[PDB]
Amino acid sequence: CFHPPYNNFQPDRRAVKRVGVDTGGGTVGLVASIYRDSKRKIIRDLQKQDIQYVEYGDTRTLIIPTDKYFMFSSPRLNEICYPGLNNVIRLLNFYPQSTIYVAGFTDNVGSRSHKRKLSQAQAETMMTFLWANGIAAKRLKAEGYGDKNAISDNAIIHGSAQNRRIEIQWFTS
């Protein structure tokens, strides 16, 4: 069984349902479970979803569309896209020691103070969710910027759309 709203913040028993449906074999159940729980499948399903994954050198980074995964123009958080967050937690469980940084980014239209406040609010909300996901608060640090550094121009519609985002960095040691 399972509950859509984050399963009340409890890691599910993904293996038991697989082994039950297989027995309804144990070996094929085990191999299917380990294959579909491999990190490669995690990243592939992230790419299938609206997730950007980057690994290079030793640091690893994640990019999330705030517009897609948030209620528009509000620190309110969307709920329909829960599997993305579930997979995020499943992947992040692999690194129980790395320090975490999370940052927010928005477009170039509006009051500068307004943009900064919205970025900070989004970062606060995201880091709060991460903390509630069982991570000790010592491992988290949040920040938000507006148009301080854009990987895409604002004069283009789609580029400006890409500009606003959520960034997650974490080292290895």
């Binding site: 123009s73 329909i80 509006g110």
Partner: protein, 137 residues
């Protein structure tokens, strides 16, 4: 099990940019108006308050347009209060109009004074049951 998304929501980049610009201009105009507006505290708000007299808590339905002194005299007579005037009558009189069904005498007089503005004032006396209409100079 069946959760719905918002229906009339900005699902497109053009839509979200439009709505964001709308929010921005709305806030800007709001604070512009806030700067523009002028307000006064009740301490210096020179308005006739409620005389809080029981005999003036009656009920009437009245419609009128025209001069003010005659109407005030009629109101005072209905209220069983003496009525007096202090000043002179300008050649061009002071005209007002009011129609109402349920508005007690005190607030009626308050409205009368407000519509009369600064050219005249009205004062009440419950010690000696009188009303005074004072002109302006």
């Amino acid at each position: 099990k069946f959760k719905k998304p918002p229906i009339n929501n900005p699902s497109d980049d053009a839509t979200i940019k439009l709505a964001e610009a709308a929010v921005s201009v709305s806030d800007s105009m709001l604070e512009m108006a806030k700067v523009e507006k002028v307000i006064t505290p009740p301490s210096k708000d020179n308005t006739l308050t409620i005389p809080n007299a029981y005999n003036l808590q009656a009920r009437a339905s009245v419609d009128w347009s025209g001069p003010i002194e005659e109407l005030t005299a009629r109101i005072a007579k209905a209220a069983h209060f003496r009525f007096r005037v202090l000043g002179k009558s300008p050649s061009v009189p002071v005209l007002i109009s009011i129609s109402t069904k349920d508005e007690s005498l005190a607030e009626i007089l308050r409205d009368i004074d407000y519509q009369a503005g600064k050219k005249a004032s009205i004062h009440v006396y419950p010690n000696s049951q009188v009303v005074e209409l004072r002109y302006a100079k």
